């Protein structure tokens, strides 16, 4: 059953050079390559969201967690550890009228579906204790109905450790790129995102929503659930734009550097000269 739990705040931070991904599946080495497609511009103004569930409040005016626009593509980032972020929802109306794409990760698999979900206003996986040993996850608070399912995909899970994703929806394909990076402090430097899966779904996507997971709270082992344990999930969102990038491949074939041609005159000169 749908319940509103999440209060979301936002700040603004700098995407220095993150979001670069391999544009094709062709091996190149010791070469500079010029490409033109949807990239996250360097030093972009990305939004840092904090989704907070605090248990034991009063009133209902504090719950605000609306779905975000998809624009031309999304750069998603997180630095979470306790599996609080489980996946995503993509679609236009996020109800039974249209089709929507749901991605869920649970510790052994990723489930990707395209169905006419009647999503809840504040969807989240409900993790509850069974037999005082196991924890079971329910989708009854993610959607109320899933009908007319047209796509399904099961594989290994997608999800101090920064997790970066790039989602694009082009020519009937939902392309995902991923990277995991051990960090200490958005970092400096480069971490080229690698292709993950190309889903052949011809869906119209305008909005997306992050899917969390919440554990039920038990005051004592003899008591029932009194709600969900207080939680916090922080992530970063940026938006792709059509740009031309000069990517550098090293001897081993990895993308070690990039230049945003439209960023400023010096980078434009570098792109014109095809040199760094």
């Amino acid at each position, epitope marked *: *059953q*749908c*319940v509103n739990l999440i209060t979301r705040t936002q700040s603004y931070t700098n995407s220095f050079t993150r979001g670069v991904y391999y544009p094709d599946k062709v091996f190149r080495s010791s070469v500079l390559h010029s490409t033109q497609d949807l990239f996250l511009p360097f030093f972009s103004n990305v939004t840092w969201f904090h989704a907070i569930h605090v248990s034991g409040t009063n009133g*209902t005016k504090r719950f605000d967690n609306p779905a975000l626009p998809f624009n031309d593509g999304v750069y998603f980032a997180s630095t979470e550890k306790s599996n609080i972020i489980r996946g995503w929802i993509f679609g236009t109306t996020l109800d039974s009228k249209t089709q929507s794409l749901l991605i869920v990760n649970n510790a052994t698999n990723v489930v990707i579906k395209v169905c006419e979900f009647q999503f809840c206003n504040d969807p989240f996986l409900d993790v509850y204790q069974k037999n005082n040993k196991s924890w079971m996850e329910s989708e*009854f608070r993610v959607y109320s109905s899933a009908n007319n399912c047209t796509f399904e995909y099961v594989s290994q899970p997608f999800l101090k450790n920064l997790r970066e994703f790039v989602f694009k929806n082009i020519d009937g394909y939902f392309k995902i790129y991923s990277k995991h990076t051990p960090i200490n402090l958005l970092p400096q430097g480069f971490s080229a995102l690698e292709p993950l899966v190309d889903l052949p779904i011809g869906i119209n996507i305008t909005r997306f929503q992050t899917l969390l997971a919440l554990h039920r709270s038990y005051l004592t082992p003899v008591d029932s659930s009194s*709600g969900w344990t207080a939680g916090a999930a922080a992530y970063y969102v940026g938006y792709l734009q059509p740009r031309t990038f000069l990517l550098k491949y090293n001897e081993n074939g990895t993308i070690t550097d990039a230049v945003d041609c439209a960023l400023d005159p010096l980078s434009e000169t570098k792109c014109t000269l095809k040199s760094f």
Partner: antibody, heavy 117, light 107 residues
Framework: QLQESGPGLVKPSEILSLTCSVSGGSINTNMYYWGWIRQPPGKGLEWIGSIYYSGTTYYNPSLKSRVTMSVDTSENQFSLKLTSVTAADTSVYFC???????????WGRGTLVTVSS | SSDLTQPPSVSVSPGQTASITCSGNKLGDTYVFWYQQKPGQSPVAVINEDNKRPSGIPERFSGSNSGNTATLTISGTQTMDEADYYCQVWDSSQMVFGGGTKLTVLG
């Protein structure tokens, strides 16, 4: 504390209307749903529907075309309407509060409605 | 879930143990709640979340849930335990009740 109110006699092919008033607490909470459960005399319990502070509703599929529930947070009330009633709708109706919308902790006293001409 | 099956009647001698069974597809994957209704009154929850007793319920009420079967066990059954017991589950978008079991105490 939950109290039901409404007519106890309804003509067939007319509208059954009930209202539950809540005291000692506020409907304006995210932790509870507010539902209706009916029981024919001598028979079992059947859940009619549940409503949320924001107006989100769940309905019994066998009555979804005839059931409509509304919520009034200012007055701490929630109401049920059932159209095109027949004798099969003669029963005792409880208004209940549903912790997390999955169980019942407090029931109403129950009001008996008879559908007859 | 989506279908709960209950025996219509269970008869037990005083002081013995009464077992009321609820059957459904993959009940072990969902919480089951037990309600007791005495004649002329409103139901009261005796068990929540398959094994939890709310406040005020005698310690002789116990619950279990495994596979496709949920069990409500009353130990040292007394005359006052003579009532109607219902199992309840929440499926995707509906609340499902059992048919109800009438507990009779012999002797």
């Amino acid at each position: 504390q939950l109290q039901e109110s409404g007519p106890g006699l309804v003509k067939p092919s007319e509208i059954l209307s009930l209202t539950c008033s809540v005291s000692g607490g506020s409907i304006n909470t995210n932790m509870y749903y507010w539902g209706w459960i009916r029981q024919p005399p001598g028979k079992g319990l059947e859940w009619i529907g549940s409503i949320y502070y924001s107006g989100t509703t769940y309905y019994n599929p066998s009555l979804k075309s005839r059931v409509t529930m509304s919520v009034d947070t200012s007055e701490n009330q929630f109401s049920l309407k059932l159209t095109s009633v027949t004798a099969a709708d003669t029963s005792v109706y409880f208004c209940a509060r549903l912790p997390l919308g999955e169980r019942i902790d407090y029931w109403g006293r129950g009001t008996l409605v008879t559908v007859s001409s | 879930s989506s279908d709960l099956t209950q025996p219509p009647s269970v008869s037990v001698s005083p002081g013995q143990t009464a077992s009321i069974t609820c059957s459904g597809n993959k009940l072990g994957d969902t919480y089951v709640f037990w309600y007791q209704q005495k004649p002329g009154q409103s139901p009261v929850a005796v068990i929540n979340e398959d094994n939890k007793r709310p406040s005020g319920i005698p310690e002789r009420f116990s619950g279990s849930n495994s596979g496709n079967t949920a069990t409500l066990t009353i130990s040292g059954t007394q005359t006052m335990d003579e009532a109607d017991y219902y199992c309840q589950v929440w499926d995707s978008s509906q609340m499902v009740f059992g048919g109800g079991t009438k507990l009779t105490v012999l002797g």
